Design a protein around this nucleic acid. Structure first.
Ligand SMILES: COC(=O)[C@H](O[C@H]1CC[C@@H](n2cc(C)c(=O)[nH]c2=O)C1)P(=O)(O)O
Ligand SMILES: OC[C@H]1O[C@@](CO)(O[C@H]2O[C@H](CO)[C@@H](O)[C@H](O)[C@H]2O)[C@@H](O)[C@@H]1O
Ligand SMILES: [Mg+2]
Ligand SMILES: [Mg+2]
Ligand SMILES: [Mg+2]
Lengths: 555, 412
DNA sequence: TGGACGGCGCCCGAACAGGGACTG
DNA sequence: CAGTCCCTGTTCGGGCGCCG
């Protein structure tokens, strides 16, 4: 017989499909050494088994060195078995953030020893694990082996491991309601308000508990020793920080260089306030080769300078005090870039972050502020389970004007005004009623689908008129164009009548920024006016000035 | 103890796989506790990653309640059981319900826990409980009994229900009773006291069959419509007549009788918007004959039970919200306005949330169906807050629209 | 050497969806 | 009427970061 450790989780292939037959890699003997080495050591313990050719399945395998170790780590590429294996439901729903930890008097961190290998595979499934082991190049075939436990590289390994592990920890935790255990993969963070002696008792009890299930806890455990290394962070009794971030120094930048770089900077932005990736990311747009070398703009060069400088000074986050409120304050950084700090006691930050996302062809700061407030809420709800009270650089009246008037449902949760500039505003406002004594411009434009040639023009109650010819255009653009002309040729107060739905919807949403250069100029003009009233009439109803300027811009 | 009625998903369709969304701390606590007592009562039992299927779960408090209710968002499973509860074991709809002077809604969902569930089905009721700050991986479950808020539950229990009900349907021959999912709709033309009393009677009557009742009172004969209305002015400016013609022009896709020529006439020049236009004879009459058509019915609009309801909502400002329920465009089976709901003048998402529930409810009373909503809101804005305001045990289908108001058709 | 798995985050670009306006 | 075209907005996959 072989032996059975802890309750197994049933597995299957995707019905009416069969296993992993593919030939092994031309592996360099250096690895082949390290391989048969730990291979053989398995079987004594029940991890693998030899198999009669009655097992018709083969899949390649090769080790990669374990980082920060002399030791080597074993990976079986199961990709072809994964493809044909039943789908699972991942139980890892996200990552724990340090800023979410409450303050604990005493804290232990223990890694599980050979975690995937201490967990039983499924009986009926085991066969499918079949792979074949080299000896040395050209010497012999090498023996074929079937796993008795969870292989590294299957697609089911993480979910089954985490699930089993939790099932095991349930009774201890139920036995110790006041112990906090953060369980992530095989990493355990144990903490308590116990006095360091009693606490360590419990640590030992737990190590014992995990032992009953075959789960080793070596003494490669942080005991008395702040800082603890956890999830890429350093944990201190009152503070935490990211493990130091190295940013490449390269004199000539490739595309891959900027990716590593950018992603490093996004990781950094959870604590160092004010990181900006905008101009550096601009550099990756419409490039072919990840290998290709690309030059840094004086924009992306400037950005990178201040980002490195932010990193210069050591910063740290604090922990969470459920008794006190959470506060998120937001600063506008320019070019649709936003940073925020979530804190409790002024100046002691839980975490920081940025919202840079450009959403829409035309938008404004109020919308992007709303977007960031929502980004920040969900984030908060994940980590602390509650929404921060918000401190925002937008006047309370600015906001009341926007949301009441907007045609869409919009909301910000409980929040208060902070007078830190730049303040968020609305740069212009359309009148709700036509302006007495203001010239009324009827505008239209049309364009020919085939020529892509067109006209944009206007007619007015005062007799004023214009028609402008345009090239390589569209119907929409000529309508925008007609409005632009009416804005340009008119006084500080103006009534404009368009039949364009497209143009009218854009402008009514009070954009302050656009991808379209034409919209930007329109915006630019709108800001200079004292009063603009925009009205819509249907086309081709023989309405008023609308009929006349419709004629003019067809001709 | 009972015979489990088998269930299959609609042909050539697979179970729901839908990620669980973040929960606030109070909801995770409420759920962790609810699920404990549900495990120890055998209604649900823990499971593992082997089961590929998942449905979102969260919790709510009914209107004025203060007690948490578990709510599963079964919309995706129900779409894949749709066959079953319409074609085979489904429920008939009482066209008289809407005429009653009062209708009370009771939560009978607890009853469904009695019946067990086809064992081959439970794999599909899978739902994960999240942890705050991802302390723990997800604690997964699946249902051993008829789950609340599955469309299969009130159907399988229909036989049981009718039996428990039958005595009281006979004692009270004319009181209409409808069942839509976890709810029992009950209505009478009795005065308020008689009505309330008789509800209590139905309650006891439900109790000795082993069920509770944690009731909402509607009044379908109070429910009004919101016709399209043209304004009343002593003088008309050019703007006014442009705005008017635009509206009538749009209205003409509904009421074909509408005429703009005599009103268009007033607009002939190129005139300043604020300039006053007195109204010609033939325009005064055309405007009149229009006002009258907008009083009429639309020709040939009726409800077709094979087609989905669609609900559009518009935000009118100042608390007001207008809506229209329809099956085919421009043929509206009903149109309405809401004002001063909870959150008026402070929170749109709460008001919109309130409006979607009120509208859904009328559709349940009237047609026994829920509409698919077209919501005037950004997906993220809604998806961030809607659960916070959700007071109801069902969840309609929705999609999100951006439609600027070039004309105000539905509200002056 | 070139190379496996799950989770989450950012950013990008290609592909898909649908709505209004014009064109046979 | 159907079939294009603009245009705008979503969704999805792939690249990197980070965790085991
Ligand atoms: O982390 C740990 O502790 C490891 O445990 C297991 C949990 C997931 C497994 N794992 C890990 C890595 C890093 C990796 O590239 N691939 C991989 O499959 C190993 P370890 O026992 O190797 O230390
Ligand atoms: O599923 C993607 C995304 O949409 C949601 C709600 O926005 O999906 C649910 O709602 C849809 C619209 O009613 C349903 O069609 C769908 O079946 C249902 O899952 C969320 O679940 C999710 O965030
Ligand atoms: Mg380990
Ligand atoms: Mg035109
Ligand atoms: Mg779930």
């Amino acid at each position: 017989v072989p032996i059975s450790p802890i309750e197994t989780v049933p597995v299957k292939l995707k019905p009416g499909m069969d296993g992993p037959k593919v030939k092994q890699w031309p592996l360099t003997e250096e690895k082949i050494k390290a391989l048969v080495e730990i291979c053989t050591e398995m079987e004594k313990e029940g991890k693998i088994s030899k198999i009669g050719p009655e097992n018709p399945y083969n899949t390649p395998v090769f080790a990669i060195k374990k980082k920060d170790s002399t030791k080597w780590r074993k990976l079986v590429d199961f990709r072809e078995l994964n493809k044909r294996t039943q789908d699972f439901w991942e139980v890892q729903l996200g990552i724990p953030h340090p800023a979410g930890l409450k303050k604990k008097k005493s804290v232990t961190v223990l890694d599980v020893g050979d975690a995937y290998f201490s967990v039983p595979l499924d009986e009926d499934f085991r066969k499918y694990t079949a792979f074949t082991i080299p000896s040395i190049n050209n010497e012999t075939p090498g023996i074929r082996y079937q796993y008795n436990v969870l292989p590294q590289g299957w697609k089911g390994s993480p979910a089954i491991f985490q699930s089993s592990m939790t099932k095991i920890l349930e009774p201890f935790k139920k036995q110790n309601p006041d112990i906090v255990i953060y369980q992530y993969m095989d990493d355990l963070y144990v903490g308590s308000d116990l006095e360091i002696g009693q606490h360590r008792t419990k640590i030992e009890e737990l190590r014992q508990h995990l032992l009953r299930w075959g789960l080793t806890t070596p003494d490669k455990k942080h005991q008395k020793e702040p800082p603890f290394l956890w999830m890429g962070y350093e944990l201190h009794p009152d503070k935490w920080t990211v493990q130091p971030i190295v940013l490449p120094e390269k004199d000539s930048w490739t595309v891959n260089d900027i990716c590593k770089l950018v992603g490093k900077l996004n990781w950094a932005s959870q604590i160092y306030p004010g990181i900006k990736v905008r101009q550096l990311s601009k550099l990756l747009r419409g490039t072919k080769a990840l290998t290709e070398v690309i030059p840094l703009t004086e924009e992306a060069e400037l950005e990178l300078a201040e980002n490195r400088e932010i990193l210069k000074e050591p910063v740290h986050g604090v922990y969470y005090d459920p008794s006190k409120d959470l506060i998120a304050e937001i600063q506008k950084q320019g070019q649709g870039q936003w940073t925020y700090q979530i804190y409790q006691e002024p100046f002691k930050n839980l975490k920081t972050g940025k919202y840079a996302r450009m959403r829409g062809a035309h938008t404004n700061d109020v919308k992007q502020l709303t977007e960031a407030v929502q980004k920040i809420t969900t984030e908060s709800i994940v980590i602390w389970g509650k929404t921060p009270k918000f401190k925002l650089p937008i006047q309370k009246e600015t906001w009341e004007t926007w949301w009441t008037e907007y045609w869409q449902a919009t909301w910000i949760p409980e929040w208060e005004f902070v007078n830190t500039p730049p303040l968020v505003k609305l740069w212009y406002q359309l009148e709700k009623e036509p302006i007495v004594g203001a010239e009324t411009f009827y505008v239209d434009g049309a364009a020919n689908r085939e020529t892509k040639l067109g006209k944009a023009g206007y007619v007015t109650n005062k007799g004023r008129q214009k028609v402008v010819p345009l090239t390589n255009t569209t119907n929409q653009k000529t309508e925008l164009q007609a409005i632009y002309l009416a804005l340009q040729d008119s006084g500080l107060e103006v009534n404009i009548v368009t039949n364009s739905q497209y143009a009218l919807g854009i402008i009514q949403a009070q954009p302050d920024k656009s991808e379209s250069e034409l919209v930007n100029q329109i915006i630019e003009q709108l800001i200079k006016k004292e009063k603009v009233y925009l009205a819509w009439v249907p086309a081709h109803k023989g309405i008023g000035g609308n009929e006349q300027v419709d004629k003019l811009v067809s001709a | 103890p009972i015979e489990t009625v088998p269930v299959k998903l609609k042909p050539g369709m697979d179970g729901p796989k839908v990620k669980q969304w973040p929960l606030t701390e109070e909801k995770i606590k409420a759920l962790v506790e609810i699920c404990t007592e549900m495990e120890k009562e055998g209604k649900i039992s823990k499971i593992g990653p082997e089961n590929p299927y998942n449905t979102p779960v969260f919790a709510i408090k009914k209107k004025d309640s203060t007690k948490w209710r578990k709510l599963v968002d079964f919309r995706e499973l129900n779409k894949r059981t749709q066959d079953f509860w319409e074609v085979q074991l489904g429920i008939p709809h009482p066209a008289g319900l809407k005429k009653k002077k009062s209708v009370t809604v009771l939560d009978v969902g607890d009853a469904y826990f009695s019946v067990p569930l086809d064992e081959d089905f439970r794999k599909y009721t899978a739902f994960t409980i999240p942890s705050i700050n991802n302390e723990t991986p997800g604690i997964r479950y699946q249902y051993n009994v008829l789950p609340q808020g599955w469309k299969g539950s009130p159907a399988i229990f229909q036989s049981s229900m009718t039996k428990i009900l039958e005595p009281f349907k006979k004692q009270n021959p004319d009181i209409v009773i409808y069942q839509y999912m976890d709810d029992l709709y009950v209505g009478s033309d009795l005065e308020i006291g008689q009505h309330r009393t008789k509800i209590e009677e139905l309650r006891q009557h439900l109790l000795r069959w082993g069920l509770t009742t944690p009731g909402y009172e509607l009044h379908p004969d109070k429910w009004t419509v919101q016709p399209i209305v043209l304004p009343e002015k002593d003088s008309w400016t050019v703007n006014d007549i442009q705005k008017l013609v635009g509206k009538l022009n749009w209205a003409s896709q509904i009421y074909p009788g509408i005429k703009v020529r005599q009103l268009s006439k007033l607009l002939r020049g190129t005139k300043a918007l604020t300039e006053v236009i007195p109204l010609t004879e033939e325009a005064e009459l055309e405007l009149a004959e229009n006002r009258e058509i907008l009083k009429e019915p639309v020709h040939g609009v009726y409800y077709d039970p094979s087609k989905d309801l669609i609900a559009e909502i518009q935000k009118q400002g100042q608390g007001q919200w207008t809506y229209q329920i329809y099956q085919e465009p421009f043929k509206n089976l009903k149109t309405g306005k809401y004002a001063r709901m909870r959150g008026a003048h402070t929170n749109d998402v709460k008001q919109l949330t309130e409006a979607v529930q009120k509208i859904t409810t009328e559709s349940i009373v009237i047609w026994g169906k829920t509409p698919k909503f077209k919501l005037p809101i950004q997906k993220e804005t809604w998806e961030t807050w809607w659960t916070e305001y959700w007071q109801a045990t069902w969840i309609p289908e929705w999609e999100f629209v951006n439609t600027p108001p070039l004309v105000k058709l539905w509200y002056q």
